[PDB]
Write a structure and sequence with these properties.
The PDB classes it as protein binding. Keywords: Magnetosome associated protein, protein-protein interaction, TPR motif, protein binding. Three copies of one chain form a homotrimer. Chain A is mostly helical. Chain A has a single domain, classed as Tetratricopeptide repeat domain (Serine Threonine Protein Phosphatase 5, Tetratricopeptide repeat), CATH 1.25.40. Chains in contact: A-B, A-C, B-C. The interface between A and B is small, with 11 and 10 residues.
Chain lengths: ~180, ~180, ~180
Protein backbone atom coordinates (compact mmCIF):
# COMPACT_ATOMS: atom_id res chain seq x y z
CA UNK A 1 0.00 0.00 0.00
CA UNK A 2 2.93 2.33 0.70
CA UNK A 3 4.00 3.74 -2.77
CA UNK A 4 7.62 3.75 -4.06
CA UNK A 5 7.83 7.52 -3.85
CA UNK A 6 6.93 7.46 -0.15
CA UNK A 7 9.54 4.71 0.50
CA UNK A 8 12.14 6.86 -1.22
CA UNK A 9 11.38 10.13 0.51
CA UNK A 10 11.09 8.33 3.84
CA UNK A 11 14.49 6.89 3.23
CA UNK A 12 16.16 10.20 2.37
CA UNK A 13 14.36 11.84 5.30
CA UNK A 14 15.84 9.33 7.64
CA UNK A 15 19.35 9.94 6.40
CA UNK A 16 19.02 13.70 6.88
CA UNK A 17 17.70 13.26 10.48
CA UNK A 18 20.51 10.77 11.30
CA UNK A 19 23.26 13.09 9.91
CA UNK A 20 21.53 15.70 12.20
CA UNK A 21 20.24 18.27 9.59
CA UNK A 22 16.52 18.72 10.30
CA UNK A 23 16.12 21.66 8.01
CA UNK A 24 16.84 19.48 4.99
CA UNK A 25 14.82 16.58 6.25
CA UNK A 26 11.73 18.75 6.39
CA UNK A 27 11.82 19.30 2.68
CA UNK A 28 11.65 15.52 2.12
CA UNK A 29 9.07 14.88 4.84
CA UNK A 30 6.82 17.31 3.00
CA UNK A 31 7.19 15.07 0.02
CA UNK A 32 6.50 11.89 1.84
CA UNK A 33 3.40 13.63 3.17
CA UNK A 34 2.40 14.69 -0.30
CA UNK A 35 2.37 11.09 -1.48
CA UNK A 36 0.93 9.35 1.55
CA UNK A 37 -1.55 12.01 2.44
CA UNK A 38 -3.52 10.83 5.45
CA UNK A 39 -0.52 8.81 6.88
CA UNK A 40 0.34 10.37 10.16
CA UNK A 41 3.97 9.30 10.39
CA UNK A 42 5.50 11.92 8.07
CA UNK A 43 3.52 14.59 9.84
CA UNK A 44 4.72 13.22 13.13
CA UNK A 45 8.34 13.35 11.95
CA UNK A 46 7.81 16.98 10.72
CA UNK A 47 6.71 17.72 14.22
CA UNK A 48 9.87 16.30 15.69
CA UNK A 49 11.92 18.22 13.08
CA UNK A 50 10.25 21.52 13.67
CA UNK A 51 10.75 21.10 17.47
CA UNK A 52 14.50 20.48 17.05
CA UNK A 53 14.77 23.64 14.92
CA UNK A 54 13.09 25.60 17.70
CA UNK A 55 10.07 26.45 15.49
CA UNK A 56 7.81 25.48 18.36
CA UNK A 57 4.50 27.00 17.42
CA UNK A 58 4.54 25.28 14.03
CA UNK A 59 5.46 21.97 15.68
CA UNK A 60 2.34 22.26 17.83
CA UNK A 61 0.33 22.80 14.69
CA UNK A 62 1.75 19.73 12.98
CA UNK A 63 1.22 17.57 16.04
CA UNK A 64 -2.39 18.70 15.92
CA UNK A 65 -2.63 17.52 12.33
CA UNK A 66 -1.31 14.17 13.54
CA UNK A 67 -3.85 14.06 16.42
CA UNK A 68 -6.67 14.81 14.00
CA UNK A 69 -5.82 11.64 12.17
CA UNK A 70 -5.09 9.57 15.31
CA UNK A 71 -6.63 11.09 18.41
CA UNK A 72 -4.86 8.67 20.75
CA UNK A 73 -1.41 8.97 19.20
CA UNK A 74 0.58 8.57 22.31
CA UNK A 75 3.85 10.05 21.20
CA UNK A 76 2.24 12.98 19.34
CA UNK A 77 0.68 14.04 22.64
CA UNK A 78 3.87 13.52 24.67
CA UNK A 79 5.78 15.63 22.23
CA UNK A 80 3.13 18.33 21.94
CA UNK A 81 2.94 18.47 25.75
CA UNK A 82 6.68 18.85 25.88
CA UNK A 83 6.71 21.79 23.50
CA UNK A 84 3.70 23.51 25.03
CA UNK A 85 5.74 23.44 28.24
CA UNK A 86 8.97 24.80 26.63
CA UNK A 87 6.92 27.73 25.29
CA UNK A 88 5.39 28.34 28.75
CA UNK A 89 1.78 27.56 27.70
CA UNK A 90 1.13 25.65 30.93
CA UNK A 91 -2.70 25.59 31.03
CA UNK A 92 -2.82 24.00 27.63
CA UNK A 93 -0.05 21.48 28.45
CA UNK A 94 -1.81 20.14 31.59
CA UNK A 95 -4.63 18.15 29.97
CA UNK A 96 -2.22 16.75 27.32
CA UNK A 97 0.44 15.63 29.78
CA UNK A 98 -2.21 14.30 32.14
CA UNK A 99 -3.38 12.18 29.17
CA UNK A 100 0.22 10.93 28.65
CA UNK A 101 0.62 9.87 32.25
CA UNK A 102 -2.74 8.04 31.97
CA UNK A 103 -1.35 6.02 29.00
CA UNK A 104 2.17 5.49 30.36
CA UNK A 105 1.85 5.60 34.12
CA UNK A 106 5.31 4.20 34.77
CA UNK A 107 7.07 6.90 32.82
CA UNK A 108 9.00 9.23 35.06
CA UNK A 109 9.80 11.72 32.36
CA UNK A 110 6.10 12.24 31.74
CA UNK A 111 5.35 12.89 35.41
CA UNK A 112 8.34 15.26 35.51
CA UNK A 113 6.97 17.22 32.59
CA UNK A 114 3.57 17.23 34.28
CA UNK A 115 5.06 18.52 37.49
CA UNK A 116 6.85 21.33 35.64
CA UNK A 117 3.52 22.18 34.04
CA UNK A 118 1.62 22.33 37.31
CA UNK A 119 4.41 24.46 38.78
CA UNK A 120 4.19 26.90 35.88
CA UNK A 121 0.44 27.26 36.44
CA UNK A 122 1.01 28.06 40.12
CA UNK A 123 -0.56 24.86 41.37
CA UNK A 124 2.43 24.09 43.51
CA UNK A 125 1.15 21.15 45.59
CA UNK A 126 0.14 19.34 42.44
CA UNK A 127 3.58 19.91 40.92
CA UNK A 128 5.17 18.35 44.03
CA UNK A 129 2.79 15.37 43.86
CA UNK A 130 3.83 14.82 40.20
CA UNK A 131 7.52 15.36 40.60
CA UNK A 132 7.56 13.03 43.58
CA UNK A 133 6.00 10.35 41.40
CA UNK A 134 8.86 10.95 38.92
CA UNK A 135 11.42 10.62 41.71
CA UNK A 136 9.77 7.40 42.98
CA UNK A 137 9.63 5.95 39.47
CA UNK A 138 13.33 6.77 38.81
CA UNK A 139 15.27 7.59 41.96
CA UNK A 140 18.63 7.75 40.32
CA UNK A 141 17.76 10.89 38.33
CA UNK A 142 19.27 14.08 39.77
CA UNK A 143 16.98 16.40 37.81
CA UNK A 144 13.89 15.22 39.73
CA UNK A 145 15.32 15.62 43.23
CA UNK A 146 16.59 19.02 42.17
CA UNK A 147 13.18 20.32 41.09
CA UNK A 148 11.54 18.87 44.20
CA UNK A 149 14.13 20.90 46.04
CA UNK A 150 13.28 24.14 44.32
CA UNK A 151 9.59 23.47 44.56
CA UNK A 152 9.98 23.20 48.31
CA UNK A 153 12.00 26.41 48.26
CA UNK A 154 9.05 28.29 46.77
CA UNK A 155 6.77 26.82 49.41
CA UNK A 156 9.10 28.47 51.94
CA UNK A 157 9.84 25.06 53.50
CA UNK A 158 13.63 25.21 53.48
CA UNK A 159 14.04 22.21 55.77
CA UNK A 160 12.72 19.74 53.19
CA UNK A 161 14.40 21.54 50.31
CA UNK A 162 17.73 20.87 51.95
CA UNK A 163 16.88 17.16 52.38
CA UNK A 164 16.19 16.92 48.67
CA UNK A 165 19.37 18.79 47.87
CA UNK A 166 21.61 16.82 50.24
CA UNK A 167 20.41 13.91 48.13
CA UNK A 168 21.17 15.86 44.95
CA UNK A 169 24.71 16.08 46.21
CA UNK A 170 25.00 12.42 47.33
CA UNK A 171 24.01 11.52 43.79
CA UNK A 172 26.42 13.98 42.02
CA UNK A 173 29.25 12.55 44.11
CA UNK A 174 28.69 8.83 43.40
CA UNK A 175 28.38 9.62 39.62
CA UNK A 176 32.03 10.84 39.54
CA UNK A 177 32.91 7.81 37.24
CA UNK B 1 57.22 48.56 -5.30
CA UNK B 2 54.93 47.26 -2.55
CA UNK B 3 56.32 48.88 0.53
CA UNK B 4 57.09 47.57 3.89
CA UNK B 5 54.02 48.60 5.82
CA UNK B 6 51.81 46.82 3.28
CA UNK B 7 53.97 43.67 3.41
CA UNK B 8 53.63 43.73 7.16
CA UNK B 9 49.93 44.28 7.48
CA UNK B 10 49.37 41.78 4.68
CA UNK B 11 51.37 39.27 6.64
CA UNK B 12 49.51 39.83 9.91
CA UNK B 13 46.23 39.75 8.06
CA UNK B 14 47.01 36.41 6.62
CA UNK B 15 47.85 34.98 10.02
CA UNK B 16 44.57 36.16 11.46
CA UNK B 17 42.56 34.64 8.55
CA UNK B 18 44.48 31.31 8.84
CA UNK B 19 43.89 31.08 12.63
CA UNK B 20 40.20 31.68 11.66
CA UNK B 21 39.54 35.10 13.37
CA UNK B 22 38.16 37.40 10.67
CA UNK B 23 37.15 40.14 13.02
CA UNK B 24 40.77 40.83 13.90
CA UNK B 25 41.99 40.47 10.34
CA UNK B 26 39.74 43.24 9.26
CA UNK B 27 41.51 45.73 11.42
CA UNK B 28 44.77 44.91 9.66
CA UNK B 29 43.29 44.73 6.16
CA UNK B 30 42.11 48.30 6.72
CA UNK B 31 45.67 49.22 7.30
CA UNK B 32 46.99 47.41 4.29
CA UNK B 33 44.38 49.31 2.33
CA UNK B 34 45.44 52.59 3.94
CA UNK B 35 48.97 52.10 2.69
CA UNK B 36 48.31 50.59 -0.74
CA UNK B 37 45.29 52.69 -1.56
CA UNK B 38 44.11 51.77 -5.06
CA UNK B 39 45.31 48.11 -4.70
CA UNK B 40 42.29 45.91 -4.93
CA UNK B 41 43.60 42.89 -3.07
CA UNK B 42 43.10 44.20 0.51
CA UNK B 43 39.63 45.34 -0.36
CA UNK B 44 38.96 41.92 -1.84
CA UNK B 45 40.11 40.25 1.34
CA UNK B 46 37.94 42.64 3.42
CA UNK B 47 35.08 41.40 1.37
CA UNK B 48 35.88 37.81 2.08
CA UNK B 49 36.20 38.66 5.80
CA UNK B 50 32.97 40.53 6.01
CA UNK B 51 31.15 37.67 4.29
CA UNK B 52 32.48 35.14 6.75
CA UNK B 53 31.31 37.34 9.63
CA UNK B 54 27.86 37.48 8.06
CA UNK B 55 28.01 41.22 7.53
CA UNK B 56 26.70 40.66 4.00
CA UNK B 57 25.51 44.08 2.95
CA UNK B 58 28.87 45.57 3.80
CA UNK B 59 30.67 42.78 1.88
CA UNK B 60 28.68 43.69 -1.18
CA UNK B 61 29.77 47.26 -0.72
CA UNK B 62 33.44 46.35 -0.52
CA UNK B 63 33.24 44.03 -3.49
CA UNK B 64 31.84 46.97 -5.40
CA UNK B 65 34.84 49.01 -4.39
CA UNK B 66 36.97 46.23 -5.81
CA UNK B 67 35.05 46.08 -9.08
CA UNK B 68 35.34 49.87 -9.46
CA UNK B 69 39.10 49.33 -9.57
CA UNK B 70 38.97 46.13 -11.70
CA UNK B 71 35.72 45.81 -13.49
CA UNK B 72 36.43 42.24 -14.68
CA UNK B 73 37.71 40.98 -11.34
CA UNK B 74 36.50 37.47 -11.72
CA UNK B 75 36.52 36.44 -8.08
CA UNK B 76 35.07 39.67 -6.78
CA UNK B 77 32.06 38.99 -8.98
CA UNK B 78 31.78 35.39 -8.00
CA UNK B 79 31.79 36.29 -4.34
CA UNK B 80 29.44 39.24 -4.69
CA UNK B 81 27.04 37.01 -6.57
CA UNK B 82 27.24 34.45 -3.84
CA UNK B 83 26.42 36.91 -1.17
CA UNK B 84 23.64 38.62 -3.17
CA UNK B 85 22.06 35.16 -3.33
CA UNK B 86 22.45 34.44 0.40
CA UNK B 87 20.66 37.68 1.16
CA UNK B 88 17.84 36.83 -1.34
CA UNK B 89 18.55 39.67 -3.77
CA UNK B 90 18.07 37.43 -6.77
CA UNK B 91 17.39 39.96 -9.55
CA UNK B 92 20.75 41.63 -8.82
CA UNK B 93 22.58 38.32 -8.48
CA UNK B 94 21.57 37.06 -11.97
CA UNK B 95 23.55 39.46 -14.13
CA UNK B 96 26.61 39.00 -11.88
CA UNK B 97 26.47 35.20 -11.86
CA UNK B 98 25.71 35.18 -15.58
CA UNK B 99 28.99 37.12 -15.96
CA UNK B 100 30.89 34.56 -13.88
CA UNK B 101 29.61 31.63 -15.91
CA UNK B 102 30.67 33.53 -19.04
CA UNK B 103 34.23 33.82 -17.70
CA UNK B 104 34.36 30.30 -16.17
CA UNK B 105 32.01 28.15 -18.17
CA UNK B 106 33.26 24.90 -16.81
CA UNK B 107 32.60 25.78 -13.22
CA UNK B 108 29.73 23.76 -11.78
CA UNK B 109 29.51 25.78 -8.63
CA UNK B 110 28.86 28.97 -10.60
CA UNK B 111 26.11 27.28 -12.56
CA UNK B 112 24.62 26.04 -9.32
CA UNK B 113 24.55 29.47 -7.80
CA UNK B 114 23.01 30.78 -11.05
CA UNK B 115 20.33 28.11 -10.94
CA UNK B 116 19.49 28.99 -7.35
CA UNK B 117 19.26 32.66 -8.38
CA UNK B 118 16.89 31.95 -11.26
CA UNK B 119 14.79 29.79 -8.98
CA UNK B 120 14.55 32.57 -6.43
CA UNK B 121 13.37 34.98 -9.12
CA UNK B 122 10.64 32.57 -10.16
CA UNK B 123 12.17 31.74 -13.43
CA UNK B 124 11.95 28.06 -12.94
CA UNK B 125 12.84 26.68 -16.39
CA UNK B 126 15.93 28.77 -16.42
CA UNK B 127 16.94 27.50 -13.02
CA UNK B 128 16.58 23.90 -14.22
CA UNK B 129 18.69 24.72 -17.31
CA UNK B 130 21.47 26.09 -15.09
CA UNK B 131 21.32 23.40 -12.44
CA UNK B 132 21.38 20.74 -15.09
CA UNK B 133 24.59 22.29 -16.43
CA UNK B 134 26.02 22.05 -12.97
CA UNK B 135 25.03 18.38 -12.74
CA UNK B 136 26.54 17.70 -16.12
CA UNK B 137 29.76 19.45 -15.21
CA UNK B 138 30.07 17.57 -11.89
CA UNK B 139 27.83 14.51 -11.71
CA UNK B 140 29.19 13.23 -8.41
CA UNK B 141 27.82 16.18 -6.46
CA UNK B 142 24.67 15.28 -4.47
CA UNK B 143 23.68 18.91 -3.87
CA UNK B 144 22.97 19.46 -7.59
CA UNK B 145 20.80 16.40 -8.13
CA UNK B 146 18.93 17.31 -5.00
CA UNK B 147 18.03 20.84 -6.17
CA UNK B 148 17.10 19.52 -9.61
CA UNK B 149 14.76 17.24 -7.72
CA UNK B 150 13.13 19.98 -5.75
CA UNK B 151 12.93 22.19 -8.80
CA UNK B 152 10.96 19.51 -10.58
CA UNK B 153 8.77 19.17 -7.44
CA UNK B 154 7.77 22.83 -7.80
CA UNK B 155 6.97 22.28 -11.44
CA UNK B 156 4.51 19.60 -10.23
CA UNK B 157 6.45 16.93 -12.22
CA UNK B 158 6.89 14.37 -9.48
CA UNK B 159 7.95 11.63 -11.90
CA UNK B 160 11.24 13.35 -12.80
CA UNK B 161 11.80 14.60 -9.26
CA UNK B 162 11.88 11.00 -8.06
CA UNK B 163 14.38 10.08 -10.83
CA UNK B 164 16.67 12.80 -9.58
CA UNK B 165 16.20 11.76 -6.01
CA UNK B 166 16.69 8.03 -6.64
CA UNK B 167 20.04 9.21 -7.91
CA UNK B 168 20.49 11.30 -4.79
CA UNK B 169 20.13 8.11 -2.83
CA UNK B 170 22.40 5.97 -5.06
CA UNK B 171 25.09 8.59 -4.47
CA UNK B 172 24.57 8.85 -0.64
CA UNK B 173 24.90 5.06 -0.43
CA UNK B 174 28.15 4.69 -2.39
CA UNK B 175 29.73 7.55 -0.33
CA UNK B 176 29.29 5.36 2.79
CA UNK B 177 31.50 2.59 1.19
CA UNK C 1 29.58 30.82 62.27
CA UNK C 2 29.05 29.53 58.65
CA UNK C 3 26.06 27.19 58.84
CA UNK C 4 25.11 23.92 57.25
CA UNK C 5 22.66 25.17 54.64
CA UNK C 6 25.24 27.72 53.38
CA UNK C 7 27.98 25.05 53.24
CA UNK C 8 25.65 22.89 51.19
CA UNK C 9 24.43 25.47 48.67
CA UNK C 10 27.98 26.80 48.35
CA UNK C 11 29.08 23.29 47.57
CA UNK C 12 26.43 22.69 44.93
CA UNK C 13 27.10 26.14 43.51
CA UNK C 14 30.72 25.34 43.02
CA UNK C 15 29.95 22.10 41.18
CA UNK C 16 27.63 23.91 38.79
CA UNK C 17 30.26 26.60 38.05
CA UNK C 18 32.99 23.95 37.56
CA UNK C 19 30.83 21.87 35.15
CA UNK C 20 30.34 25.28 33.36
CA UNK C 21 26.53 25.87 33.77
CA UNK C 22 26.15 29.33 35.33
CA UNK C 23 22.43 29.49 34.87
CA UNK C 24 21.94 26.63 37.32
CA UNK C 25 24.54 27.89 39.74
CA UNK C 26 22.66 31.13 40.11
CA UNK C 27 19.66 29.36 41.57
CA UNK C 28 21.86 27.93 44.31
CA UNK C 29 23.86 31.12 44.92
CA UNK C 30 20.52 32.80 45.60
CA UNK C 31 20.05 30.23 48.30
CA UNK C 32 23.43 30.62 49.80
CA UNK C 33 22.72 34.33 49.89
CA UNK C 34 19.34 33.70 51.56
CA UNK C 35 21.02 31.88 54.42
CA UNK C 36 24.16 33.99 54.88
CA UNK C 37 22.55 37.34 54.23
CA UNK C 38 25.20 40.05 54.65
CA UNK C 39 28.01 37.70 53.46
CA UNK C 40 29.43 39.20 50.35
CA UNK C 41 30.87 36.08 48.78
CA UNK C 42 27.64 34.62 47.35
CA UNK C 43 26.72 37.98 45.95
CA UNK C 44 30.18 38.27 44.44
CA UNK C 45 29.77 34.82 42.83
CA UNK C 46 26.34 35.84 41.46
CA UNK C 47 28.16 38.71 39.86
CA UNK C 48 30.62 36.50 38.15
CA UNK C 49 27.77 34.19 37.03
CA UNK C 50 25.64 36.94 35.62
CA UNK C 51 28.62 38.36 33.72
CA UNK C 52 29.37 34.94 32.13
CA UNK C 53 25.73 34.71 31.01
CA UNK C 54 26.07 38.13 29.36
CA UNK C 55 23.47 39.68 31.71
CA UNK C 56 25.83 42.61 32.26
CA UNK C 57 23.57 45.29 33.71
CA UNK C 58 22.37 42.95 36.43
CA UNK C 59 26.01 41.96 37.19
CA UNK C 60 26.87 45.58 37.78
CA UNK C 61 23.93 45.79 40.18
CA UNK C 62 25.07 42.77 42.17
CA UNK C 63 28.65 43.94 42.31
CA UNK C 64 27.28 47.13 43.76
CA UNK C 65 25.50 45.13 46.46
CA UNK C 66 28.86 43.53 47.22
CA UNK C 67 30.60 46.94 47.35
CA UNK C 68 27.96 48.29 49.74
CA UNK C 69 29.00 45.53 52.19
CA UNK C 70 32.76 45.84 51.49
CA UNK C 71 33.69 49.14 49.94
CA UNK C 72 37.24 48.10 49.16
CA UNK C 73 36.40 44.71 47.74
CA UNK C 74 39.24 44.61 45.30
CA UNK C 75 37.87 41.94 42.95
CA UNK C 76 34.36 43.27 43.01
CA UNK C 77 35.71 46.52 41.58
CA UNK C 78 37.95 44.89 39.05
CA UNK C 79 35.02 42.82 37.75
CA UNK C 80 32.59 45.72 37.76
CA UNK C 81 35.09 47.81 35.91
CA UNK C 82 35.55 45.06 33.35
CA UNK C 83 31.81 44.82 32.68
CA UNK C 84 31.21 48.59 32.58
CA UNK C 85 33.83 48.62 29.84
CA UNK C 86 32.31 45.66 27.91
CA UNK C 87 28.99 47.59 27.95
CA UNK C 88 30.72 50.78 26.70
CA UNK C 89 29.98 52.85 29.83
CA UNK C 90 33.49 54.32 29.81
CA UNK C 91 33.01 57.40 32.06
CA UNK C 92 31.75 55.22 34.85
CA UNK C 93 34.47 52.57 34.39
CA UNK C 94 37.38 55.07 34.69
CA UNK C 95 37.19 55.86 38.42
CA UNK C 96 36.63 52.14 39.25
CA UNK C 97 39.59 50.95 37.11
CA UNK C 98 41.76 53.75 38.37
CA UNK C 99 40.97 52.41 41.89
CA UNK C 100 41.99 48.86 40.87
CA UNK C 101 45.31 50.05 39.48
CA UNK C 102 45.87 51.93 42.75
CA UNK C 103 45.41 48.68 44.66
CA UNK C 104 47.25 46.41 42.23
CA UNK C 105 49.80 48.55 40.50
CA UNK C 106 51.75 45.68 39.06
CA UNK C 107 48.75 44.17 37.30
CA UNK C 108 49.01 44.57 33.52
CA UNK C 109 45.52 43.47 32.88
CA UNK C 110 44.15 46.28 35.03
CA UNK C 111 46.15 48.88 33.20
CA UNK C 112 45.01 47.37 29.88
CA UNK C 113 41.41 47.65 30.88
CA UNK C 114 42.10 51.19 32.06
CA UNK C 115 43.68 52.10 28.73
CA UNK C 116 40.73 50.73 26.81
CA UNK C 117 38.45 52.83 29.02
CA UNK C 118 40.36 56.05 28.44
CA UNK C 119 40.36 55.32 24.72
CA UNK C 120 36.60 54.82 24.72
CA UNK C 121 36.18 58.21 26.46
CA UNK C 122 38.28 59.89 23.78
CA UNK C 123 41.17 60.68 26.11
CA UNK C 124 43.65 59.11 23.78
CA UNK C 125 46.94 60.22 25.36
CA UNK C 126 45.86 58.80 28.69
CA UNK C 127 44.93 55.54 26.99
CA UNK C 128 48.40 55.28 25.51
CA UNK C 129 50.00 56.04 28.90
CA UNK C 130 47.94 53.16 30.51
CA UNK C 131 48.45 50.69 27.74
CA UNK C 132 52.16 51.37 27.73
CA UNK C 133 52.23 50.54 31.43
CA UNK C 134 50.53 47.28 30.57
CA UNK C 135 53.08 46.47 27.90
CA UNK C 136 55.93 47.39 30.29
CA UNK C 137 54.47 45.24 33.03
CA UNK C 138 53.96 42.27 30.63
CA UNK C 139 55.95 42.60 27.40
CA UNK C 140 55.19 39.09 26.12
CA UNK C 141 51.49 39.85 25.68
CA UNK C 142 50.49 40.50 22.01
CA UNK C 143 47.19 42.07 22.93
CA UNK C 144 48.83 45.12 24.50
CA UNK C 145 51.26 45.88 21.69
CA UNK C 146 48.37 45.50 19.34
CA UNK C 147 46.22 48.06 21.04
CA UNK C 148 49.15 50.43 21.35
CA UNK C 149 49.45 50.08 17.62
CA UNK C 150 45.87 50.94 16.93
CA UNK C 151 45.95 53.76 19.42
CA UNK C 152 48.79 55.28 17.48
CA UNK C 153 46.86 54.74 14.26
CA UNK C 154 44.05 56.93 15.55
CA UNK C 155 46.58 59.57 16.53
CA UNK C 156 47.55 59.59 12.84
CA UNK C 157 51.14 58.65 13.81
CA UNK C 158 51.59 55.69 11.48
CA UNK C 159 55.35 55.48 12.00
CA UNK C 160 55.05 54.39 15.65
CA UNK C 161 52.04 52.19 15.00
CA UNK C 162 54.17 50.17 12.61
CA UNK C 163 56.91 49.82 15.24
CA UNK C 164 54.36 48.39 17.65
CA UNK C 165 52.96 46.09 15.00
CA UNK C 166 56.38 44.88 13.74
CA UNK C 167 56.70 43.76 17.32
CA UNK C 168 53.23 42.20 17.23
CA UNK C 169 54.50 40.14 14.35
CA UNK C 170 57.87 39.21 15.96
CA UNK C 171 55.88 37.89 18.89
CA UNK C 172 53.26 35.93 16.79
CA UNK C 173 56.17 34.25 14.95
CA UNK C 174 58.15 33.09 17.98
CA UNK C 175 54.89 31.67 19.50
CA UNK C 176 53.49 29.24 16.82
Amino acid sequence: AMGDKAKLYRNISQRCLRRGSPEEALRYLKEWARHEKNDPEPLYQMGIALANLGDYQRAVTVFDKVLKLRPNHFMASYRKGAVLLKIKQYKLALPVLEAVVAAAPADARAYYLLGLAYDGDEQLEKGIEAMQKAVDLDPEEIKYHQHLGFMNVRKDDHKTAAEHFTKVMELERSQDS
